[PDB]
Coordinates of C-alpha atoms in Angstrom, one line a residue:
X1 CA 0.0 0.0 0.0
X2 CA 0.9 4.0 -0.7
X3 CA 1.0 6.6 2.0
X4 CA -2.0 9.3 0.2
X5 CA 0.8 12.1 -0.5
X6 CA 2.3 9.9 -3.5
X7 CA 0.6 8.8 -6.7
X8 CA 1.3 5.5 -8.1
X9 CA 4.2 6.9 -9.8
X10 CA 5.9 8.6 -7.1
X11 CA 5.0 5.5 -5.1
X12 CA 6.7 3.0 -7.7
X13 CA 9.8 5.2 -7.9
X14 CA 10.2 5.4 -4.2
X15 CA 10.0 1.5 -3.7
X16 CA 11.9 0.6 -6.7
X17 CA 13.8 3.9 -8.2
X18 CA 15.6 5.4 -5.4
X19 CA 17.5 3.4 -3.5
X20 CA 18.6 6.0 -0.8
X21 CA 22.0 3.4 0.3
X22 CA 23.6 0.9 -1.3
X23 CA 22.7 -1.7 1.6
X24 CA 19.1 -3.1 1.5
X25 CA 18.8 -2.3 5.7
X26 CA 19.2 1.2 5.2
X27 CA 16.9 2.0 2.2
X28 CA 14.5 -0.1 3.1
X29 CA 14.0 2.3 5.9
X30 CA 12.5 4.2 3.7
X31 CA 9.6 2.5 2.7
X32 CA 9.1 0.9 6.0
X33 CA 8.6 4.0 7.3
X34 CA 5.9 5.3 5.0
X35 CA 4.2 2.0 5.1
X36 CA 4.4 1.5 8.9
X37 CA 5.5 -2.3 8.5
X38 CA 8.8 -4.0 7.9
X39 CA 8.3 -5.0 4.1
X40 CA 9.0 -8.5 3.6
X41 CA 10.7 -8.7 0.5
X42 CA 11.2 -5.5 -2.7
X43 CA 13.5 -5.1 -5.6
X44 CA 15.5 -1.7 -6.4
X45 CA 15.9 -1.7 -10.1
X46 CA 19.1 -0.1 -10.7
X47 CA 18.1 1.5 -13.8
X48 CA 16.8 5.4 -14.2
X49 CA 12.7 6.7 -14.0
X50 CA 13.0 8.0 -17.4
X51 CA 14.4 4.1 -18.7
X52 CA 11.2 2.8 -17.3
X53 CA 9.1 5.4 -18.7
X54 CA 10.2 4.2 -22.3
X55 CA 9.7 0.5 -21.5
X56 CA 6.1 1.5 -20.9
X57 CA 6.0 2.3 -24.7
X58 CA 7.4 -1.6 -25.5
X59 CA 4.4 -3.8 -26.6
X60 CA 1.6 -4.6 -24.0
X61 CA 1.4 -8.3 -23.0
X62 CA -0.5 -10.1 -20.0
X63 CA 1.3 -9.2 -16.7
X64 CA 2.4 -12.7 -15.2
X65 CA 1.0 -11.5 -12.0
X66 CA -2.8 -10.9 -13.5
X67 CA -4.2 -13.3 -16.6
X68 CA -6.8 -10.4 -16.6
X69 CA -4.5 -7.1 -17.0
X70 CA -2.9 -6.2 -20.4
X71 CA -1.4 -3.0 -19.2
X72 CA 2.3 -4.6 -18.6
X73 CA 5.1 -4.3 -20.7
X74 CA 8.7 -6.3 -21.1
X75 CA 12.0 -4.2 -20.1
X76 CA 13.7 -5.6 -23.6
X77 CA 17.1 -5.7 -21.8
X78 CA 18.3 -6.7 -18.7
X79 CA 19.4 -4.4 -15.9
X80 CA 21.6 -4.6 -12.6
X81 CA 19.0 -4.7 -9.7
X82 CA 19.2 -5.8 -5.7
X83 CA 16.6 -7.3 -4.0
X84 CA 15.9 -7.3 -0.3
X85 CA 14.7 -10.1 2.0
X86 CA 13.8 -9.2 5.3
X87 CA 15.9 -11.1 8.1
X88 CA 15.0 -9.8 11.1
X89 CA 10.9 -8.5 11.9
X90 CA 10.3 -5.8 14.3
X91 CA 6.7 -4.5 14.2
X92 CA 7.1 -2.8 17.6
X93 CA 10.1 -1.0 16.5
X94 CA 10.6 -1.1 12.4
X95 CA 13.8 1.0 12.5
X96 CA 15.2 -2.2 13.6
X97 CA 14.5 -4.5 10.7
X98 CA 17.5 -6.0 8.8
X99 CA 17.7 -7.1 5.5
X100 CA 19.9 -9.2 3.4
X101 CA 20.9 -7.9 0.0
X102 CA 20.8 -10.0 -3.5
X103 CA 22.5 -8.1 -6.7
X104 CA 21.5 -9.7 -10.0
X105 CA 20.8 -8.8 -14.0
X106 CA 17.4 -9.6 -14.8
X107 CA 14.6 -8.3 -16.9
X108 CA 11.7 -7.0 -15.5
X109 CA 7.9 -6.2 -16.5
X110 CA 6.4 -3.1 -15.0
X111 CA 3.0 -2.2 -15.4
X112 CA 2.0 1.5 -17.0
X113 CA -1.1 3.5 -16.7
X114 CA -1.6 7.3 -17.5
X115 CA -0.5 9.5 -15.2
X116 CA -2.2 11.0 -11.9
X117 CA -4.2 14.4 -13.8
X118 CA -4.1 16.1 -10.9
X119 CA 0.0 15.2 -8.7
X120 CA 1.8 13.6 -12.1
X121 CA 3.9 16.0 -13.9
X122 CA 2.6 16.4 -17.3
X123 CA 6.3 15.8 -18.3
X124 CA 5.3 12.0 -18.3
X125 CA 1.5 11.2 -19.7
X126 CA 2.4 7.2 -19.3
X127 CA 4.3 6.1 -16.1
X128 CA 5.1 2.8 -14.3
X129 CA 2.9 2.4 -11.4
X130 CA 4.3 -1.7 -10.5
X131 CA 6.7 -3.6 -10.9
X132 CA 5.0 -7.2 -12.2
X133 CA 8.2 -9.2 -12.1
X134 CA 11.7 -9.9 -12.6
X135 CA 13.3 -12.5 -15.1

């Protein structure tokens, strides 16, 4: 779930754009703390917003996650990425959650949908809004 100050966009590039460290503890702080729960698991594609943005104009195809949704589209290439595992809950205090960290190259498929009318910069009239998988 997103905190009601970011659109889906913002949301997606928070959870899988900007990975504030390096080390999956630290950044996941981040969205922990906007989410009020120790995530279990998220990927950081090491790749830039405006790279996503132009796989959203790749093909459509069925997102693997949804038989019903058409709105995903395949990253062509690979990219580097890290994805964290949680290690170590803390509901009572989420600032102490660990993580493990796991670098790869994978392809992904993100899902697109026009942007937010009313928060989205009209820079952007497609944008990611979730990431389906990673290959």
């Amino acid at each position: 779930m997103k905190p009601p100050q970011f659109t889906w966009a913002q949301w997606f590039e928070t959870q899988h754009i900007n990975m504030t460290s390096q080390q999956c503890t630290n950044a996941m702080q981040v969205i922990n703390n906007y989410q009020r729960r120790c995530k279990n698991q998220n990927t950081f594609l090491l790749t830039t917003f405006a790279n996503v943005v132009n796989v959203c104009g790749n093909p459509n195809m069925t997102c693997p996650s949804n038989k019903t949704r058409k709105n995903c589209h395949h990253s062509g290439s690979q990219v580097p990425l890290i994805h964290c595992n949680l290690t170590t809950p803390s509901p009572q205090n989420i600032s102490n959650c660990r993580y493990a960290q796991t670098p790869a190259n994978m392809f992904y498929i993100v899902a697109c949908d026009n942007r937010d009318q009313r928060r989205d910069p009209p820079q952007y009239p497609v944008v990611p809004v979730h990431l389906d998988r990673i290959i």
